[PDB]
Structures are given as C-alpha cells and as structure tokens.
Amino acid sequence: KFPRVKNWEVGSITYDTLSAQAQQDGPCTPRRCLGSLVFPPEQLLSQARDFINQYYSSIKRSGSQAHEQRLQEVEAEVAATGTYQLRESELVFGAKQAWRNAPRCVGRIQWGKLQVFDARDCRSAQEMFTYICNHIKYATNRGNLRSAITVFPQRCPGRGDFRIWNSQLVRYAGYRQQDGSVRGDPANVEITELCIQHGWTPGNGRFDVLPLLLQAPDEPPELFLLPPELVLEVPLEHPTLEWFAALGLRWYALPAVSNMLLEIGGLEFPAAPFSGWYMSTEIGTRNLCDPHRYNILEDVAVCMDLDTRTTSSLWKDKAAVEINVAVLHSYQLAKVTIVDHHAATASFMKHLENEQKARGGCPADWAWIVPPISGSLTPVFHQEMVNYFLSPAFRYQPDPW
C-alpha cells in the first residue's frame, strides 16, 4: 500500500507514503502501463475544503480561528455565487504547490522561489499584453532570469475563457514550402498558420519570433507584436569550433509555457503563463537535434568531418555533445541563466530527499526527469520513482480551437 522505492547507485530504500493521497487517477492499470504516453456542478466544495486545509497546515495553523473562519466564507461564497475567490496569499500558495506537484519538472528544487503576478482584475487582450509584457521583462531581467507566473482571471460558466493561443510566449515561426517541408521550427507550423491568418506579415527566416494571439472572454483573438527589445535571444557559438557561429543558430532566453491550465482549490485558470530558465538539453538536444524539430544533427557532423556513413562511429552522439556545449557556452557568455543536465538532476536528487522529509515522497515522472542525453550518467537514472497526480496542479488543456 506504500510503494517501496530503491536507489540503485547507493542501495537506499524509501517508501512513498504521499502517493496514498493521489487524486485525479492516471492512465495505468494493473494490466498495462501507460507511463510513457505524453498526453495520458458543485464538487468545487470538496476541492476547496482540501486546499484551504492544505494552506493552513502549511502555515502551522490547522484547527485555528482563521482556519474555521475561512472555511465558512468559501462555503458562503459558493452557496451564493456558485464559485469563490482565492485570498491573494492562497493564490501565491497554490501556484507554488502546483509547481511543487509537477511530476515532469526536474527543476522543482526552486519551487519556493516564485514571483506571482495577480492579473485576476484583467479585461481585454490589450490588458493581457501589458500583463504579459511586464512578466517577460521582470522574468528576463537582462539575463539574470527569475521564475514568475502571471495568473489571469479564473473560469466561470456562461463566459468564455482567457487564453494565450501560443504554447510559449516566445516561439519561432514555421513556414511550409513549394514542397511541404518547413523553414523554421516545425513544432509551430499550426500557430504560424493561425498568426499569418489573423493578419501578420510573415518573415523569410529560420528564427522569426512569432506574434502573440491573445483572447479575452467571448471575443476573437488579437495579434500583438512583441517589443523586440523585450525578447532576449542568444546567438549560438562554439568555444573552439570557429565555424559553428556561421551556422547562424540562435535561441531565446526565457522558457515561458503559455498554454497550461492552473488548478487551485477546484478553481481553473486557463490563462496562467509560467517561466523559469532553461536546462541546456532542452535547447541543444530536443529543440535543435530532434528529427521533427530543427534537425541539425547531421549538418553539425559534416562540419566536424565525422563519418556519417556508419552509425557505429557514434557521429550522432559526438555532434550532439558539441551542440550542447555550444548552448551552455553561448548562454554563459551572454550572462543568461542556464543549467546543465548534470547540475539539474543532482539538484533534483536533493529535492527528492527534501520532499521525503517534508511530505513523505514526491510525484516524479522517470521518463521526463532523466535527460535526453547521457541518462545513466546522471543520478536520477538509478533512482526508482513513483508517478501520481496531486493538487494544486498544472494540467494540459485542449487548444482553444
């Protein structure tokens, strides 16, 4: 009933007792495991009781005056309005907990250092844009990156949602050709097609920053050109491969997910963009070397004069490491915050032991915590993990179309 979990590098055994609390059931059964799949009126009071109970136990305040009192006020708000409002401190507490509960996030050692911008008093896309622009400039901070989330108004029935239509606040364009293939990032062909559709003049480039499609309740979206001085980018160069600069590769400083739904206490915020800083394999391995992404691996190998005629030269492996070195070197030279996959996973091990002591476990998704290069060279590879869903949470949600 309490999973026994082992670390094979050291031999140590822990029990995940926190797992016994898991709520929104996952996709696995005793008959088949689906852990490797990416995407697997008044029950509101149940989720509310539990979250407010969480909040007060966290501040050493269970069964106290402010606790029972706040419980009645949510009872009364829902009774009269069919919903409720979070106290500002609860909204701050819920955002940090959801980050803390994200099983696929390797950077949760940072979960208590998060800046929350309360945008629950927002109306119209033009207003979101200034909220978003303030987030970006605050989080970017001339390259000394700072974790932030901007929380736009919660969801109510009979009224449409606030939504950011881009998956991230900074994405590069993907344009097709006289032959189907894509100039730019193929991960964003859809939203590039939607932006151009809504009256944006495309570029001719591999690294064109897309505009933003912001949508206010029960209204169509609006394009917004991001201020170019607010979008910090890093040209990629290699410390010793002089020709790497000539490949013309770049990436942006701020990873800011703008398509996930934040759920606290039974309330749902479909517009809540959050940002941290990059782990270097995200850029150098997934974004630039994935076959369906920029797919540069062979081009770098030719420049390195590697033998691409046989897979057993490990030319792929060699080129991939140099691309990752170039990312780290370039961000450091730009003085933009970035973390390598060894340093991050080592910190995640530290986080796991923190969370064992504090909460008796930590939901973690082994396939997402283990980096996409050098997996067994990092300590998380040899750590057995337990994956489950706790609330507050970040959840995926359908594209708003």
Ligand X SMILES: CNCc1cc(F)c(F)c(-c2cc(C)cc(N)n2)c1
Given the residues 99, 111, 251, 277, the one annotated as active site? 277
CA angle 270, 90, 358 (to 5 degrees): 105
CB atoms within 10 A of CB 141: 16
Q: Is 277 annotated as catalytic?
A: yes
Collapsing DSSP to helix, strand or coil, 203 comes out as coil
With 0-12 CB in 10 A as exposed, 13-18 as middle and 19+ as buried, what is 197? exposed
Q: Which of 100, 108, 163, 171 is catalytic?
A: 108
The verdict on whether residue 367 carries a ligand-binding annotation is yes
Residue from 10, 13, 33, 76 that binds Zn ion (CB under 5 A)?
33
Q: Contact between 3 and Zn ion (CB under 5 A)?
A: no
Question: Residue 86 CB: number of other CB atoms within 10 A?
Answer: 24
- Spatial CA neighbour of 103 closest among 17, 30, 56, 38: 38
Q: x/- contact string, 216-255, with ligand X (CB under 6 A)?
A: ---------------------------------------x
Footprint (CB under 6 A) of ligand X, residues 259-278 = 274-276, 278
Check if 171 is active-site: no
**Per CB under 8 A, 47 contacts a second copy:** no
8 binding ligand H4B? (CB under 6 A): yes
Interface of this chain with Gd ion, residues 308 to 337, rule: CB under 5 A: none
CA-to-CA dists, residue 232 to 41, 138, 209, 210, angstroms:
44, 12, 11, 14
Q: Note the maximum CA span of the chain.
A: 73
Q: Which is nearer to ligand X, 14 or 147 (CB)?
A: 147
Among 183, 318, 359, 382, binds ligand H4B (CB under 6 A): 382
Contacted by 83, from ligand H4B, ligand X, a second copy, none: CB < 5 to 8 Å by type: none
Q: Does 385 bind a second copy (CB under 8 A)?
A: yes
Site string for a second copy, 304-323 (x = CB under 8 A): -------xxxx-xxx-xx--
Least distance to Gd ion, CB of residue 241, Å = 6
Could you say which of Gd ion, ligand X, a second copy, none residue 340 binds, taking C-beta under 5 to 8 angstroms by partner kind?
A: a second copy
The answer to whether the annotation marks 326 as part of a ligand binding site is no
Distances (CA, A) of 292 to 206, 296, 373: 14, 10, 17
60: left (phi over 0), alpha (psi -120 to 50) or beta: left
Whether 181 has a binding-site annotation, put simply, is no
Q: Which residues contact 339 (CB under 8 A, 6 or more apart)?
A: 107, 277, 278, 279, 280, 347
CB 107 within 8 A of CB 348: yes
Query: Does residue 153 have a cis bond before it (omega within 30 degrees)?
Result: no
383 is in an annotated binding site: no
CA angle 138, 139, 140 (to 5 degrees): 95
Q: Which of 165, 183, 155 is nearest to 263 (CA)?
A: 155
Whether 195 has a binding-site annotation, put simply, is no
Question: Does 282 show up as a binding residue in the annotation?
Answer: yes
Please confirm, yes or no, whether 105 is among the known catalytic residues: yes
Site for a second copy in 65-104 (CB under 8 A): none
Exposure of 152 by Cβ count < 10 A (0-12 exposed, 13-18 middle, 19+ buried)?
buried
Which C-beta is closer to ligand X: that of 196 or that of 346? 346
Judged by CB under 5 A, the stretch of 54-62, 110-118, 238-246, 273-281 that binds Gd ion is 238-246
Nearer to ligand H4B, 134 or 347 (CB): 347
Give the catalytic positions in this structure: 105, 108, 277, 282
Annotated binding site: 28, 33, 36, 105, 168, 277-278, 282, 286-287, 367-368, 381, 396
**Residues engaged in binding ligand H4B (CB under 6 A):** 8, 36, 38, 367-368, 381-384
Binding site for Zn ion (CB under 5 A): 28, 33, 35
**What residue numbers does the annotated binding site for L-arginine cover?**
168, 277-278, 282, 287
